Amino acid sequence: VSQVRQNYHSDCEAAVNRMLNLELYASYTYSSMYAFFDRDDVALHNVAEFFKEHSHEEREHAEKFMKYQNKRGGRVVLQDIKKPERDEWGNTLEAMQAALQLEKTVNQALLDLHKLATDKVDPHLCDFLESEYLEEQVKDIKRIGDFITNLKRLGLPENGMGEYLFDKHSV
Amino acid sequence: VSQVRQNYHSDCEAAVNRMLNLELYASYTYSSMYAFFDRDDVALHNVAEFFKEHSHEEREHAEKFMKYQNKRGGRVVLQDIKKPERDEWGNTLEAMQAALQLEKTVNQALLDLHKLATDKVDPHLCDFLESEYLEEQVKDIKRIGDFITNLKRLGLPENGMGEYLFDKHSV
Amino acid sequence: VSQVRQNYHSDCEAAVNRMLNLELYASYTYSSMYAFFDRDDVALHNVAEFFKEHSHEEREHAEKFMKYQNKRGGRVVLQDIKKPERDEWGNTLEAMQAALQLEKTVNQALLDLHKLATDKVDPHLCDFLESEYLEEQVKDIKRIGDFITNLKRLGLPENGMGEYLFDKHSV
Amino acid sequence: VSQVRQNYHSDCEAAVNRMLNLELYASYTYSSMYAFFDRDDVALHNVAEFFKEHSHEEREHAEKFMKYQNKRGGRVVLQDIKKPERDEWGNTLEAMQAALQLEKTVNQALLDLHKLATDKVDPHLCDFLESEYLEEQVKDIKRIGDFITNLKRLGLPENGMGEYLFDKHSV
Numbered sequence: 131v132s133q134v135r136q137n138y139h140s141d142c143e144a145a146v147n148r149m150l151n152l153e154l155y156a157s158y159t160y161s162s163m164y165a166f167f168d169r170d171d172v173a174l175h176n177v178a179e180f181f182k183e184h185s186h187e188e189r190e191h192a193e194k195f196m197k198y199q200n201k202r203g204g205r206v207v208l209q210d211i212k213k214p215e216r217d218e219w220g221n222t223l224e225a226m227q228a229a230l231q232l233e234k235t236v237n238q239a240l241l242d243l244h245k246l247a248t249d250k251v252d253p254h255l256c257d258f259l260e261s262e263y264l265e266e267q268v269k270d271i272k273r274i275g276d277f278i279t280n281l282k283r284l285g286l287p288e289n290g291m292g293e294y295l296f297d298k299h300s301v
Numbered sequence: 302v303s304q305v306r307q308n309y310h311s312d313c314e315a316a317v318n319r320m321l322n323l324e325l326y327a328s329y330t331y332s333s334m335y336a337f338f339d340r341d342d343v344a345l346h347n348v349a350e351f352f353k354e355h356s357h358e359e360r361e362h363a364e365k366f367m368k369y370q371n372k373r374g375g376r377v378v379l380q381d382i383k384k385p386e387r388d389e390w391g392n393t394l395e396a397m398q399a400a401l402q403l404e405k406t407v408n409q410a411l412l413d414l415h416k417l418a419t420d421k422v423d424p425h426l427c428d429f430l431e432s433e434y435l436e437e438q439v440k441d442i443k444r445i446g447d448f449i450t451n452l453k454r455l456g457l458p459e460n461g462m463g464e465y466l467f468d469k470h471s472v
Numbered sequence: 473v474s475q476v477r478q479n480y481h482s483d484c485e486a487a488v489n490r491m492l493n494l495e496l497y498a499s500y501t502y503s504s505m506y507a508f509f510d511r512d513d514v515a516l517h518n519v520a521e522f523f524k525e526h527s528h529e530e531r532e533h534a535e536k537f538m539k540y541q542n543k544r545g546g547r548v549v550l551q552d553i554k555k556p557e558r559d560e561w562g563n564t565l566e567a568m569q570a571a572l573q574l575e576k577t578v579n580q581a582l583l584d585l586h587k588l589a590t591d592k593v594d595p596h597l598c599d600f601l602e603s604e605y606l607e608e609q610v611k612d613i614k615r616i617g618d619f620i621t622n623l624k625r626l627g628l629p630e631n632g633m634g635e636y637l638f639d640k641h642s643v
Numbered sequence: 644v645s646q647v648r649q650n651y652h653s654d655c656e657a658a659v660n661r662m663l664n665l666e667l668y669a670s671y672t673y674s675s676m677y678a679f680f681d682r683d684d685v686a687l688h689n690v691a692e693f694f695k696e697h698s699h700e701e702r703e704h705a706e707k708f709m710k711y712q713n714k715r716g717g718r719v720v721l722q723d724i725k726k727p728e729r730d731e732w733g734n735t736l737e738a739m740q741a742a743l744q745l746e747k748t749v750n751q752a753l754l755d756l757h758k759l760a761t762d763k764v765d766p767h768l769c770d771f772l773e774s775e776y777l778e779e780q781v782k783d784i785k786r787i788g789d790f791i792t793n794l795k796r797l798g799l800p801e802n803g804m805g806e807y808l809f810d811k812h813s814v
C-alpha cells in the first residue's frame with residue numbers, strides 16, 4: 131500500500147473510481163447533446179454551447195476525482211466510457227429532461243458515495259464531496275428545472291417560436 | 302414625556318406606529334411573491350427580483366418611520382407582522398394585481414395619516430409624508446398599472462410566451 | 473412534488489420553514505433594540521447601529537433559507553412574525569444579555585435542524601448549515617459575550633460613564 | 644406696493660420680520676455660549692465650537708428670511724437685537740438645557756408663522772418654512788436632547804471627568 135494512505139477504505143476507493151467513470155459518462159452525454167444542437171437541421175447554437183460547457187465541467191469533475199484518488203493513496207482504475215443512451219435528442223425540452231435525469235443520477239451516486247464515506251468514517255472524503263460536488267449539483271438541478279418549466283411555458287414540444295426565443299433569452 | 306416632543310399629537314404617534322406595521326406587512330407580502338417566482342415550477346427570476354427589491358424598499362420605509370418617531374419624541378411600539386394573505390400567487394398578472402391593491406391600501410393609509418396630521422396641525426409630519434412617501438407611491442402605482450396593462454396586452458392569464466417575454470423585457 | 477426535489481425530507485422542509493421564521497423574529501427583535509437606543513432619552517447611537525446591523529443580518533439569513541428551500545424543491549410557507557418580547561430594553565447591558573439569549577436560542581434551533589438533517593441523511597442541508605450559519609453564530613455569541621464582560625467591567629447597571637464609554641469604544 | 648407682491652399678506656410680512664429678529668437673537672445667544680466655553684476657567688473648546696457653529700447657522704437663517712421678504716415684495720424692517728438672557732452659562736449641561744429651550748422657542752415661533760401662512764392661504768411661505776426650517780429644527784432639538792441625556796448619564800452637574808469626556812467624544 132501507499133505510504134500516503136491513511137483512513138482510506140478500499141470500498142471508498144472503488145466507489146470513487148466508479149464515480150469518476152460516471153462523471154466521464156455524463157460528460158460524454160453532454161458532448162452528444164452539443165453536437166445535436168449544432169446540426170444544421172436543429173440549429174439552436176446557444177443551447178448547444180450550454181451543453182458543451184457542461185461536458186467540459188463534468189470532465190473537470192472527473193479529473194478532480196483522479197487527483198483526489200492519488201492524494202489519498204488510492205489507485206485510479208479506468209473503465210470504458212459507454213456511448214450515451216441516445217443519438218438524436220429530439221428538441222430542447224426533451225434534451226433538458228434527459229439532462230435533469232442525468233444530473234439526478236449523478237447526484238444520487240454522489241449522495242451514495244457520501245453515505246459510504248460516512249459509514250466508513252472518512253471525514254475527508256465527506257468534506258470533498260460537500261465542498262466540490264453536492265452544492266454544485268443542486269445548483270445545476272435547480273437551473274435545469276427552471277429551464278424545463280420555462281420551456282413548457284413557451285409550450286415547447288409543439289411551439290417552434292417558443293424554442294427559438296428560449297435560445298435567445300434563457301441561455 | 303420626551304423633552305424633545307413639541308407639537309406632536311398622541312393620535313399622530315399612534316397612527317405612525319400603525320403605518321410602520323403596515324409597511325412591514327407590505328414588505329413581508331413582497332417577500333412571499335419573491336419566493337413564489339423563484340420556485341422551480343414558476344421560474345420567472347426577473348419578476349422575482351422585482352418583488353425582492355420592493356420588499357427591501359418597504360422595509361426601508363418602515364425604518365424611516367421608526368427614525369421619525371424618535372425624532373419627534375414619540376415611542377415605537379411594534380406589533381406582530383401578519384403573514385401575507387396568499388401562499389401561492391398564481392402568475393405574474395395575478396401577483397401584479399395583488400401588488401396594485403396592496404400599494405393602493407398603503408397609499409390610502411398614508412393619505413389618511415396625512416389628513417390626521419393636517420387636522421392636528423402638524424406641518425412637519427405632513428412634509429415628511431409628502432417628501433418621503435406620497436410621490437414614491439404614485440410612482441409605484443403608475444408603474445404596476447403599466448405592467449398590468451402590458452401583461453394583459455400579452456394576453457397573460459392564458460399566454461405563457463407572453464409571460465416569459467414580460468420577464469425578459471419589462472423588468 | 474418538485475421535479476427538482478431529491479433526498480429532501482418533508483420534516484427537514486418544515487423545520488427550515490420554521491427556522492426562517494425564527495430568523496425573522498430575531499431580526500424584528502433587533503429592530504426593537506435599534507429603535508430603543510435611538511430614543512432621545514436613551515441616546516446610545518453606536519449601540520443602536522450595532523443592533524440595526526444585526527437586524528439586517530438576520531433578515532439576510534432568513535432570505536437565504538427562502539432561497540435554500542426553493543433550491544431543494546421545498547415550498548416556503550410563511551407565518552406571522554411575533555412582536556419582540558419587550559418594548560423597552562433597559563440599558564446596554566440588559567439589551568446585550570437579551571441578545572445573548574436570543575442568539576443562543578437561534579443557535580440551538582440551528583443545531584437542532586442540523587441533527588434532524590443528520591438523522592434524515594441529508595448531507596447538503598448539513599453543509600449549508602455548517603457553511604452559512606454555525607460558525608457565524610459562535611462568532612456572534614463570542615462577541616456579545618465579550619461585550620457583556622466589558623459592560624460589567626465598566627460596572628454597567630449603575631455606572632453611566634461606563635456605558636457612555638462603551639458606546640464610543642467597543643462598537 | 645411692490646410690483647412683485649402677489650398673495651403676500653401684510654400680517655405674514657410682519658411675522659417674517661419678527662421671525663428674522665428672533666433668529667438673530669438666537670444667533671447672538673449662541674455667540675454668548677461660544678465665548679463662555681472659550682474662557683480659560685471654563686475651557687471646553689469643542690463645546691465652544693459647537694455653539695459657534697450654531698450661531699453662524701441661525702445668522703444664515705435670518706439672512707434667508709431677509710432674502711425671502713424681498714422675493715415676495717415685503718420690506719425688511721430691522722429691530723434691536725436684545726442681549727442674551729445670561730452672561731455666564733454655568734456648565735455644559737446648563738448651556739445645553741438653555742439651548743434646548745431656545746430651540747423650542749424658535750421652533751414654536753416657526754410653527755406659529757406656518758399656521759398664520761396656512762390661515763392666510765399662502766402656499767409659498769408654507770413650503771419655505773417646511774423646506775428650509777421645520778425639519779432642520781426637529782433635527783437640532785433631537786440632537787440637543789440626545790446631548791442632555793448623555794450629559795446626565797455622565798452625571799454632569801457634579802462629575803467633571805464626565806464633562807471633559809463629553810467634549811472629546813460627543814462633539
Ligand SMILES: [Mg+2]
Nearest residue numbers: 153188191236
Ligand atoms: Mg458532476
Ligand SMILES: [Mg+2]
Nearest residue numbers: 233266267270
Ligand atoms: Mg453537474
Ligand SMILES: [Mg+2]
Nearest residue numbers: 324359362407
Ligand atoms: Mg411604502
Ligand SMILES: [Mg+2]
Nearest residue numbers: 404437438441
Ligand atoms: Mg411603495
Ligand SMILES: [Mg+2]
Nearest residue numbers: 495530533578
Ligand atoms: Mg441567524
Ligand SMILES: [Mg+2]
Nearest residue numbers: 575608609612
Ligand atoms: Mg447571528
Ligand SMILES: [Mg+2]
Nearest residue numbers: 666701704749
Ligand atoms: Mg433657526
Ligand SMILES: [Mg+2]
Nearest residue numbers: 746779780783
Ligand atoms: Mg436651529
